[PDB]
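Inputs:
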Amino acid sequence: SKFGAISSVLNDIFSRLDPPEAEVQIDRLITGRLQSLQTYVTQQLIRAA
Amino acid sequence: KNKCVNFNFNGLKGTGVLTESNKKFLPFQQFGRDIADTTDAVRDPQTL
Amino acid sequence: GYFKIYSKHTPIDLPQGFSALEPLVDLPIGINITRFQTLLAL
Amino acid sequence: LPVSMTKTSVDCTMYICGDSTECSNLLLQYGSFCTQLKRALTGIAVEQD
Amino acid sequence: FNATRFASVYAWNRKRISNCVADYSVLYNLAPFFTFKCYGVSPTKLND
């Protein structure tokens, strides 16, 4: 998933965009993946209960 | 090959191990991608 | 802007079998196409 | 009646960053989210046993 | 880039560039080039 960014893989995001600019997309991807992982952990906790 | 080395093949940057391939690719294909945008295979732009 | 030519040959109306079309040539130029016409060799 | 599940451990760097080295330097600024996730997964693994 | 005649905003020219080696280092090295804007790409990362 792109998670609102221009690309899904961050390896080319760090290779095509400058560090001052790619930080927004990297933080967007990090926030999206952290939210997905937290939702997964909440669902796993409900399943474990 | 057969060693953990940083590969840069036609702009594709990353870290992985290059091994001997046993799969047969079609003559028009150039990339093999796994589930969730996982680059599993690649062809050499020099020796094909 | 790229004209694509996909073709596949299979020995044999159209049968109920399944067969995919494999890419043959990818022309990197495209024009404004509205009509087309075939040619014969009688 | 099910009594146990599959104990799953998710890594933070390999999932969020993968094989990127510049990405691992940015996860340290978010705090201890991964510490919470690993602790919850370890708790679930001990709970199933 | 340094052609003698350039077209207007209508019926603009378009050239197909393929099977060669591009070198964008000469572009930003020129003095009278004032504005150099890009979308999603960086000027320094155009060589890799």
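Chain B touches chain C at residues 26, 28 (CB under 8 Å). Flag for discussion at group meeting.
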